[PDB]
Amino acid sequence: MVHYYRLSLKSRQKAPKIVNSKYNSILNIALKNFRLCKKHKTKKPVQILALLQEIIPKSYFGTTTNLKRFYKVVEKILTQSSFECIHLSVLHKCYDYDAIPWLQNVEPNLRPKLLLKHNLFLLDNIVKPIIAFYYKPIKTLNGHEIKFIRKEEYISFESKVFHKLKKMKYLVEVQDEVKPRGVLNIIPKQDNFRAIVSIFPDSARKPFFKLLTSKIYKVLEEKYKTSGSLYTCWSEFTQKTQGQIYGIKVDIRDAYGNVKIPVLCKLIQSIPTHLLDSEKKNFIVDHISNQFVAFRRKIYKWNHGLLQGDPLSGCLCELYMAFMDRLYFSNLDKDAFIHRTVDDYFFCSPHPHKVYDFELLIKGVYQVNPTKTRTNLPTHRHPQDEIPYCGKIFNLTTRQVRTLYKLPPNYEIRHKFKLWNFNNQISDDNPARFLQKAMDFPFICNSFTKFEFNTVFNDQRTVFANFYDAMICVAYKFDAAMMALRTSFLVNDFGFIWLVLSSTVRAYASRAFKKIVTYKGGKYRKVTFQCLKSIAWRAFLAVLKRRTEIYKGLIDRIKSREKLTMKFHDGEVDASYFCKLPEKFRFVKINRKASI
């Protein structure tokens, strides 16, 4: 049942001194070389590819061609996404066996098994450990993007934050060890940091926290008013408002960290006895006051509110923020639009003066980031007409809502997708299953919602813009899968591709159509299946064109076989939007290349 090898450094093993009977002595050299390399200190930057080619002797591969096949794998590891694997077969298929010296004393038929066994050793014992020796893998959280940071630079950074947390008050040591219940970890954030904790695991059993936190969500949804659906809120607000809407988004700085510990305590116990009472009274209380964590052989106390990582912090923060909502947000025009999350508040009104008051009020209540604040008030130096909130872009004048796409400069789009599932592995001879699975719906879940396809507040042309943007992603995923088919599945005959592409276009056009009909409103004019199909195809062209070499025949096929021209029903449409890669998608990296 095992076709995959994982690329994660986590699978790495502690290299022995020498190999046993099972392996060829050739490996002992590479192990010596790995030891030598680590012992050597240079003021000159390390390239792993180059280093390995000194560590693993060429005689292990026999020929340049064999060596290059192995280092494609190493190059993938060096550029990996979370969860990514390759096929185990790539570690033996296509190798020049007659040219590998140490395999010459072994009959052809059982050579591939040995190479597999030996390649795996080098990968697990040398390739992965060398990377983790010089680099610290960091999950950037922007999709499955792994960033490799120089281990020396990380420790430098990690200490700078440690000495600062200590200097302030957030971290205070307590004498003895052997009572952590959690290990503190500093995570590099863009321009900043984030202090989280790992479990152990098996603290008190999570069935104990899960049924515990479940009763707390009840307390929130019973004793506090329901905020309601974001969609319903925006729908009802825009329809009753006829004048120029004004609005503000405010980002809350460290909502977890700026929790008043003593105040939340009073609340937890104050909740009705028939919901928690004595049983879990002090249980939660002391757990918030006694935040015990381990670091570098020492144990520290956390007193900066709820620590991110605790399986209860999430719900307790929600419970806390709800309380501060009643406490300090009591005025507020009830006709106004108000929506908030764990981190964000979003407030709108046709009366501009109530927006100013909200900005001033919010800053009195919470700690915010005026850098991450978005508003249309003619007061600010840079009044934004479109404010982003919960993965959507709200335009206050037009009332249109588009999906927000989060793609930094030089972001490698393949990091956004999960093509490999270790608990559901696909064999190397089944590329069609892999491509089809890749085109399944669940991944672009949040581009195919009420927000995108409604014609209540959204114009028909907005819906098309949303659908087109969504299909650009599907297409980028299709391209990422296509790259995996040639490099892991090692496909030669790509004939099956065309029908999978055609079905995908159909399927997505069909879902678009259904969603449009479901959420039909007064702004609807006429949407045909044919038109959506054309928009979908255009989005595939836009992405495909980035590799006019590899996708040459496929592009011609689309252009000669498919309807690419559509009729619009809004003279206000921007038809040019459908001609090309939208500028938010036009600069994402689609070429993999080792950088460390």
Cite the annotated binding site for Mg(2+) by residue number.
251-252, 343-344
Q: How far apart are CA 587 and CA 585, in angstroms?
A: 6
Alpha carbon 439 to chain centroid, angstroms: 18
Residue 477 and residue 443 in contact, taking contact as beta carbons nearer than 8 Å: yes
Cis peptide before 201 (omega within 30 of 0): yes
User: Which of 512, 385, 397 has its CA nearest to residue 454?
Assistant: 512
Alpha helices in 430-528, H assignment, sequence order: 431-438, 450-453, 460-487, 497-518
| Angle made by CA atoms 117, 119, 125, in degrees to the nearest 5 | 100
Binding-site sequence positions:
189, 194, 251-252, 254-256, 343-344, 369, 372
> Chain-centre distance of CA 207, in angstroms?
27
Strands 374-375 and 291-294 come out as: unpaired
Annotated binding site for Ca(2+): which residue ranges? 251-252, 343
DSSP 8-state symbol, 527: -
Crossing angle for the helix pair 497-518 and 552-561, to the nearest 10 degrees: 50
How far is residue 595 from each of residues 76, 147, 174, measured CA to CA in Å?
A: 11, 10, 42
Element (H, E) at 291: strand 291-294
In which element (H, E) is residue 148 found? strand 146-150
State the pairing for strand pair 392-395/386-389. antiparallel
Q: What is the DSSP letter of 257?
A: T
Binding residues for dGTP, as ranges, are 189, 194, 254-256, 369, 372
Token output for 122: 């080098």
542: enclosing H helix or E strand: helix 529-544
With beta carbons less than 8 A apart as the criterion, state whether 179 and 299 touch: yes
Q: Which one, of 373, 379, 333, lies nearest residue 356 by Cα? A: 379
Q: Report whether 396 contacts 461 (CB < 8 A).
A: no
Give the SS3 label for residue 150.
strand
290-296 LR contacts (CB < 8 Å, sep 24+): 292/174, 292/179, 292/180, 292/181, 292/182, 293/180, 293/181, 293/182, 293/183, 293/184, 293/197, 294/177, 294/180, 294/182, 294/183, 294/184, 295/162, 295/183, 295/184
C-alpha 340 chain-centroid distance: 22
Q: Residue 299 to residues 231, 258, 294, 311: CA-CA distances in angstroms?
A: 46, 22, 4, 20
